[model samples]
Target: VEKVFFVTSPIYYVNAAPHIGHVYSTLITDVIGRYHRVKGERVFALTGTDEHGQKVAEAAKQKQVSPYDFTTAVAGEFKKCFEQMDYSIDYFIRTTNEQHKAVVKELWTKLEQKGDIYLGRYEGWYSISDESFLTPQNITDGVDKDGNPCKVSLESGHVVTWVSEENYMFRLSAFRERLLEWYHANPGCIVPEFRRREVIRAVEKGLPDLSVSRARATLHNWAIPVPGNPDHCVYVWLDALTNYLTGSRLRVDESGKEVSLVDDFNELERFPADVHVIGKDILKFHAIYWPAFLLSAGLPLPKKIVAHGWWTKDRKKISKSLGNVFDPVEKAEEFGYDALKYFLLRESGFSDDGDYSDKNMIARLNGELADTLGNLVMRCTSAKINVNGEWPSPAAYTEEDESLIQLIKDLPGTADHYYLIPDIQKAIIAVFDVLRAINAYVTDMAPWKLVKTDPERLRTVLYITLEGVRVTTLLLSPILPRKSVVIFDMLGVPEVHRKGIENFEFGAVPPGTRLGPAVEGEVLFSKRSTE
Candidate 1:
């Protein structure tokens, strides 16, 4: 059955500048959305900024600006970063947007009518940095940055402060069993087995009533006002998590007019997001609180939550003083964005933390992108091998030729499985495996030797090699969009055939089609020098 695919990145917080981690998360959604698009599936990918919060207010005050101005500057930078990398995101929803505020209020009123929200006195240790309430068991005595004794969150070593105020609470404890049952029914809902188990264990321990609103006096009036109570503001997590709903309810119609899902829910049919790509730190909010809010409001919950690990620098903290900050913008400027995209997806598995370094980036760019992939493309497309500047037809079958052809034919199905499983690293390896073999085949066939001795056999070798390049280029397009265009042009591939994955057939490159004229010293991916 075909369904509209919906994917989202946790709308990034605007209190800080965009970093490599933010790009990585957004890139995951972009890759998934693009992959589905090529497969003929309608897709909606959403990402944006979470601006209305205590931290944004504090960050604005420190910068001597209004929260509106501060969030605008930072959120704009995040949008620019995604644009620079060419993310295929459908919509960027900011929590500060008026449309987002309407959706949040609607959900709040629905939950309130359902007897899920009520006034309560909230007393607990809260982490302002994390914007989360910590249970007594979750708090530990630790030293602050100044070496003074203080309470800190067990999960994140951020300082916590005790707060007591009159606010509204959600009946999260009522859904403890339901949450467990949902996890049991959908074992794959939370990705990475360890994170799933962690959420289950945490839920089994206790599901406390959640505070869903903050006293307006304490919030500096920077959050959405709780319906019917101007003295209380909706909690930041509740406000932030509703961005997905806002995105679902907002769609552009066939006439290019933006329509509200509240008016016609069937406009796009993209509700119940397929998956949410996020970092591990916010797993609780996404896995537990987010679903609970949706359930209380009688809306469909997201199908899956993927919690990936963080990135470190040489197995150490990414610090400014240590001079190991991985600024994605600077990296994209120095090396092409395609090379940076390839390194991120290729070097790290989505389920585990990865340590990044200049050495790793340079090695991957040179070794895999340049030496293995680029070398093959250049050698096969050169005038010496493809002597007539045209795609050649293969002659009678040879063992080497047959084996490589079979591998190429079998690749698309294998690639489909991995890409849908959303295993980007695996899909990349599968494609590159065929590439490495093609390079080896070129060496064994000795096309240069055959060109003079057996001209017909040389055509076959060039045919197989060019087909290999064509298939691999299509497979890698999701990650290397811009560079893939260059390779397709070199093969003289028609724009129509390059439109989607359905055209990734073995013999799709028409025989005798004139190849693009080879340029001197041209390469698909240039080698990178070490810093």
Candidate 2:
């Protein structure tokens, strides 16, 4: 059996509604999952909301509703966004679920048994807006529009005066050396290359004191209670990370019907997560805290923790109060879903920060999507339609045909390289390069001229061109599923057909397949009409 691969987007914070950033990450995961599925891999893609946080509790209080009710209502928004984007998430692991709570408790018990847990007092600057803590370095001098020093209150600046309370703490310091060594040995274990360096440099500088667990009363009233310690709540990071195992079925009862509390290291050994994709802001959580927690619990480390960069709109960070947040569903509705997908994956280098602009978006839609890809489809379909509106058999290949075929044949390997390296920019460039080459080939072959002078050669040229469309559609399916499917249907291939990095070869398109009628399709993209 093929190895199982599991991927997750960070559990989105429920303090706010879903936005373009959420869609960006989820959409990318969806595309990646689809790619693996097409290759017949046992793939699991999980995404969900982080419903239990100080932020959620405070928000609930403001709305005069129970925390559970508030979270459930917000979760609906997340579900709607994911569905609209066509995300192929296998499991939506809401952290508030009963099973997740049970699994978290079990992991805590295991850690306690291993002597990794201890009672301690934590004092720090915490950001409720981000549901994270702030170091002195994280604070910057700034003022709001009112010109008052922006005393940003996260979770209502809510502080529980615990005076002096005991709470469980995971001994993250115990595995600091091991984690540092792992980083030294496994370069690129963290993604975008530079972020890995950032993590290593931070580690070298010495890890700040971390409170791995927290008291419920001291932080916020809304948190899962620490197992055996009803007074304390599990630290946010610990509670959050436990969801990975809970969702994987690694922490489950003997009958597999109930969630298990014990750290099932043996089961985890069987289904080691292939990747943990997260935002760069939370790199330390996944890379440092998470691995140490797993080590203490006697669980295998995840294979990789790939961190991607943030998305900014119009060169400004998206913020809710500023009313500049870009909702994913709104964007998808305004610009076609595939158009937004193409913009994100094509424009954003996975590890590099990308600024989204109306100008750039329109340019991509028209130039790449409509002009390059869509036009290619139209030309191929029109050629087939001209040739008795049926699939035509091509004549023998000459040197020109061989050269074009070789380029088409090279797509699978090229695509595999990009997918493995996960260089989104390089992948988009490669696809468009093939597109430009095919267009050039059509021009050089001059099928229109040949059709009048030599009808048989025209048939061969048309057949080869349509086959090129088939290959393009197959290879581009993961990135542009909707458009690729339409192209496949136009090429007389079944619309349900999907292709992956492994299967994107030239001959996947059968020879002498008659083309179907040209559907009434508009230009996929026209030059942005600034007028």
Candidate 3:
């Protein structure tokens, strides 16, 4: 185990600019990515626009732009938003790319030869919004746009319609037993524990053979033509699911042949995914269909799938009809980027539906970021309080001293446990936990009062406070990159930090270490208004 890590945001189906739901998925993954990188692991994280299916095709036609041109237009916004939001994305993949198309085609042929695919008429109710076939039991009566009675998927609450088409079918019905076996072999592959049970129950109940491709003419020829069958187009979801493979050593060379990204022949060994973070809406595809497809093609299943919850506003399910969907870009524009990041992860803990409101966001901003954490940074660094411009040597330790240092020493391991468990909320909460401790130590130490009475003890107090700030900034860099950069500049600290960012080491700061003085008065984070 060379500490290889791979994680992905569910490739967002690019119908429009991504909502906070889409950004939240990748944001959580980015947090995981940064946490792994801090632990000194070889990590690759991907978030990309999924550019196929009926919706994209229709959007292009309506915009009067070529499919590629339309995707190019939309994907630029995704990258820019991430950059502005300060996300460290390794790569942005598009399904329309040659590399991805090759993988989809290659996988299709593999499944076809394995007798897992066959020609058949797919007759069932399908939900355009859900992008999956709906069973009669999975749907209920609903009103359509014209107010006529129609079928709706109970899972997604999207309208469904009965239809029949000539398509290629995947023998998913036969995969239930094998899928169960794989789940048994890899314990906790599906996260949140309950989600795992849901998949197992679905497989145990029964699985139907999946419709893998559609007649090209039926969809107006928008997708990759099925191998040796020009009249058929690969199903969008099936084609989309293979994108995780493309990020690895899989690419298509211009010589009109598919090639591995590296010379290595081992498909799984070359770039096995350590985790796939997805949305709960598509659990069936990632947890069940994806692994089954990999099994049919003799491909190694991804190590794990972590599906997360939806973002809601004001304790109500966020729906387009409600007109209250959150845009990641707008949230950043109003509150600072890290403020938005802090609010999102802290609010939900990343596993359940968390209520979102401007009021709640402001409370965290003013209360935590500005009042609690920001005030401490200012107190430790401001010259008015300590009357200094140079580093002070910290003297011998005592109970109050160990309170902050011990927490700093154990910080790295504590955060690592949560990051690997991939519980970013807990990881962040731990930072806040130490922060509150630092605030208390500052209060107990009374550096402001120490200056008037015992000047030497004041130096020790200020020195310890600065060290706490330095280490906290380092560990929090994963979440607050911009703020970390600014404060580090003020401190004149370089890249080399503690042995481990949040490690439990008190002696990293030697007594005579020259920290240099912090700015007289500086605001690392402020409550600025943006309408």
Candidate 4:
């Protein structure tokens, strides 16, 4: 079916600079977007900053700058980091944008007109850190920094205080049965199987009506005001979640007016995102609250939510206070950009927590990128081996040559399987599987030894090896674009046949194709020393 594969990274909060955690979520979404595009599917990938919460206001105040300037600077940092890492994002949507505010107000009107909203008095423990209200059941006894008695959120350990105020409330409690039914019907909608079960149990326990607005006075006039209520600001979560709709392409009716996502969801082509790649920490917000909000507004829910895990440093939480936050930009600059991408995906499972260590990262770069794949490419294409400096014509195939070509041809299918499962690490592993096969095949074939013994045999082996490199580079280009560019140049890959799954094949490289100028020791990926 010809459909746009809409993917989004959670619009990140701008309270801090973009960190390793932020990069991980964005990387997953980018890889998926690029993969589908290569598979000949149209893709729209969205990512940006969430700059509308109380925490952002406090952060800007600490820096003695206006929230607008602060958000602009931090958002730029995120964009720069993504560029440095070579992320292929389509649009960067910020929650504070004027268009986003308009969409938020429209959704609010729809909910109010549908009788899903009401003015209610709220009295509960509120966590400013989490920007969400907590029921008594989720509160716990705790001590603050000064050893004073306090109440904290059981889930986040952030201090909470009792707040009583007049606010607009969403009828979230009304969607409990519907949400449960949706989960049961779309069992794989939420990934990391355990997380889906948790959402189901949390819903079965019953949901209370959610407070969707805060008093404007308490928010210091930093949030979007409710459409008509001057005293209240739309809750940050409600304002922030509307960003997905804002970043999307809304269909226009015969009258030429843009169709309303809240009212005409079914008439829209890409209204519901194909996948929302998020962190496991916010499953309740994206998987539970977000979906409930869509159902209330008569909108279609996102097709899938892939909640991935966190990264730690030496088994300790990577926190700013601990002074152990890993800077991804520096890492990418120090080691190659493609090396950083490959290590992140290959070193851990998509849903499992991974520990970041310099030792582990250096090992992956040296062992896989440098020693295996990079060396294989250089070993086959160097001047001494293929003396003509062109794609060698192959003779009749032997059992080993047939086996190697079959493996190279089978890679796109194998990688596509894992990408659809949304298991990026597994998909990456599939690429290396073929790389390892080629490495072993080259060793057994020993084209260097065959050069003097049998000239025709050497030509056939080199042709097969070059074919392996061509197919592998095409498959890995989505994740390693920078390095792939140079390798493709060395292999004389035509610009027309560089991308897409349809163009991938074993025998596409014609003999007598002139190779790019060969440098004696051109390193595609340099081996980082273990200092």
Candidate 5:
């Protein structure tokens, strides 16, 4: 499934700064993304800002800057912000990228010829926030200012109003049955059982054709112009959805310069999206409209849509108006970036809604990471008693050594199964069990006692412990990349093996490989409870 995973973070519209929710979404994609790459399947990750939309223009006008200046600046923040959080993004692009515009227009023209597109006036409820026209069926009841009933988009919970505009149309009505045929046939198409069922129910209830373009005067000047009709601009989500294709910017190999990453349009293959990551709020667009769009264009549908849940703060949606918008970059940098990354993975149950609390973040940092994995690595690497700076040589086998070494041998396969789910927290859980065994092994072996009685046996314990750290580092590299390389550097893992861990095995650092001599290094993660 990772062979050509066209994974995406739903492009954040850059009318404003990114919130913690945006960072959470990107973190989820990158974790799953690199986890796949570590599985040795060819992979790349896409996360970009949608710079076009009415909100971009309107927000620009409010800030007294042009939409271009405002959007580009905000797009730059996404890179800067994610960078601050230590995100491993392969190729981040924008809706404004010429290549992206070209692809959208190309598909639009193709659909036009296939008779799935037509020129007409569209009449329905248009939610400016969502940038999609909704039939009354798509509208749900909401309260008016007078506490009377009014209609709003059931999906976004944003108010909508009746609007008639001259536009190009996508015949969503024509493709509903075809969408159902493929959607039902494909396995693992959407995640979280409830969300998948909702998509099925909504797709089956579908009949409306999509109004694919907007009037240029009322909407943002930032958009892909209709191929033949320059006055009509492709709707907002349409411009954003094309990001997955534009990110086919991949590489020859998953490793180094020889397998270099490139923006190879010639090798462009946009089918079989192994997983398309996005928020649950936008599931209908991704689950129904996206598949419908692919069917309309005679293109292969994405294999699965991993619609993840949202983050709520204090039992409410994260919002600036409520003054509860958590800054992802700021909070991540407060602790070591590695801890922030690991904390988010454990805190967010991938298939369900995750509630955020600063207290929970503190506990995950000190409890699981600082004491468990961090303490275990620190103890083994810093073992310098009765030895010069050296890797301990293995002595004769004991029952514990044989079983533990065998467990280390099986580490890659056991860890891989979880990474295949891209279940990062669970992946760590499996490896954490190895850390547990090593902790127990060190205590039971009583290596401190061995140092006095059997100095030779102590050497065996030291080698086994360092070797355990070595294997665990590779397994954990996908989630905690910076620390993995740091551990390799401290222990002097060869550059060749360091570059690629997919084919890594037990004893990559051989029996005599020199290790940390207590005097050689500092601790990996300094224990911090809170500010």
Candidate 6:
């Protein structure tokens, strides 16, 4: 009965609208959350917006409104996107919320009391677009083929400027060795395989001085004020990372009063987070800065930080100048939301960088969704209707059928492994393979013909097929929620199947349950005519 805390996308910057990447992260989180819930774990899923920052202020200025008004407006868009996408998040946190601001200020005070904060002058190459500072090596000079002077880094350049100011800094460098030791002790502290290597390598290389607190005059005014200091605001990363604490009720009670701040292993048992899923771009912030802050505050690091790859369109990284950002709502409108979710989860390995293509999407929609799974369901249901118009009582199980049953029994373990490693792409492939096997079994058995010649044999085949469908619904529920419900309804065992994964087993569906008519529905996938 371990409690699972799942986060997605890190509460995106409110400077921009929800994009395909944001959708992808949230979709995965929803899927994972559903899976854990089905396993009967206490789960909390959180998604939201990062609204307090200079970029937000600037974006608001261009719209001729206060930052609060602009953020509220954009946050509505994010909420609408989540609703349209059917993301079943438990909490949607807006950083501008009074609760969040108070939690952040409280955490800042805790860190300051721990001697992790110091006042200092800081200078660096700052990217206004990214709202982050770059090291000297990260800066370069050159214009792209489009002939715009590369202002940030020539490689991934965005316009940047050199800024020097007297500011408050967190003593991040002081915690480097301790952070490295913690990571070493906790092998899967950072996930998706590659992120751990990246974190370890960076920690081994060393940490740069972190400017964790900034002055309004040096930066901007739309940020949380530094605790006990009205002149400065907490650094963007510090403020942003505190959302995790605030949402979890780890900092304060509902009355906004500071509760007992648990700061060690025994004390943190109640506050332990199961996973923090974020985009690869922010690995440094979450794996490095956030963890350091937690340790310095005498808190245990999160169980794992799962860093996923970025999405590119036509193999080009999304950029505003390139006009390549894909909109999730628009994509869902053109293609169904389920189709978009499937394409995102199955198109590529979860940890690997994936390029989105209309061609690849159509192929998956046709092959996996439309052709394989859809055809299997249609054929099975049609055969059952043609024979008896009611489910047949299963005869004695055969060796082959038993083997399939064993596979069904083993499915939960297999799925849990993939979820633990979080190789969602591979996990999905495995599920589809099971479906393909069932379809092949149906074809070979030819229950439609058996019904006419060998009635008893037909019963066994139909029974097995229907049972297979039930198992498939349970296993795939997390990934294909809508389809899973449809399949369950078609099978007419939705109640019996309602139990969590721990309760699922082969033959869970009782025999002789009269199934309803197989209602005609739109094809799950339709092949694109190449002509």
The number of the candidate with the highest lDDT is 1
Clashes of 5: 0
> What tens digits encode model 5's per-residue C-alpha lDDT throughout 1-531?
224666778888887787777888898888877777665656667788988888788888889998888888999888888877777676677788776787788778877888888877887788877776677877988986577787888878877888888888888888788877876786457776667887878878766788888888878576778887888888878778867766664342443212332444336453446677788878878887777787777766776677777778766788888788776666667767777778777677667678767777777777777777787776665544535556666778788798998988898788887765556767788788888888888888887677779888887787887788778877888778898877877676766665355445776666666654344447777766574
The TM-score, computed over Cα atoms with residue i paired to residue i, of candidate 6 is 0.91
Summarize candidate 6's per-residue lDDT along 114-189 as a digit string, tens digits: 9978889788887776767688888878664588776566434676778788788888888889888888898877
TM-score, prediction 1: 0.96
TM-score of every model versus the real structure: 0.96, 0.89, 0.91, 0.93, 0.88, 0.91
**Candidate 3's residue-wise lDDT over 311-403, tens digit each?**
888777777777767776787887888888888888886468788888888888887888777888778766755575445776777877876
Judge candidate 4 at residue 162 and give its lDDT. Answer: 91
Of the candidates numbered 2 and 3, which has the greater TM-score value? 3
Candidate 3 residue 162 C-alpha distance from true site, Å: 1.3
Q: What lDDT score belongs to each candidate, Candidate 1 first?
A: 0.87, 0.73, 0.77, 0.85, 0.75, 0.75
Report the CA-based lDDT of candidate 1 relative to the real structure: 0.87
Cα RMSDs, all models = 2.0, 3.9, 3.5, 3.5, 3.8, 3.5
- Positional deviation of 453 in candidate 1, in angstroms? 1.5
Give me the runs in candidate 1 sitting further than 4 Å from their true place: 252-264
C-alpha displacement of 328 in model 1, angstroms? 1.1
RMSD of 1: 2.0
Task: Looking at model 6, report the run of 10 residues with the lowest lDDT sum.
Answer: 261-270
Model 2 clash pairs are 106-261, 216-233, 370-525, 391-514, 391-515
Candidate 4 residue-wise lDDT, 1-531, digit = tens: 346788999988898889998999999899889888777787878888899878788888889999899999999898888877778787777787776788899989989999999999899899888887889988999999799999999978989989899989999999999999999999889887888899999999999999999998777788999998988999999998888887675443554334443444333355688899998878899988899889988888998899998888877888878788788888877887788888888888856898878888988898889888999989888876788888888899999889988998898788887887678888778888899999999899887888778889988999888888888888788788778889999988888778766677667768888788887756888887796
Q: What is the C-alpha lDDT profile of model 2 across 165-261, one tens digit per residue?
A: 4555667667768889888887757877888888788777776556655667655678888777677777777888877887776343443233544
By TM-score, the candidates rank as 1, 4, 6, 3, 2, 5
Off by over 4 Å in 5: 1-5, 39-42, 135-151, 249-272, 314-316, 385-388, 499-503, 516-521
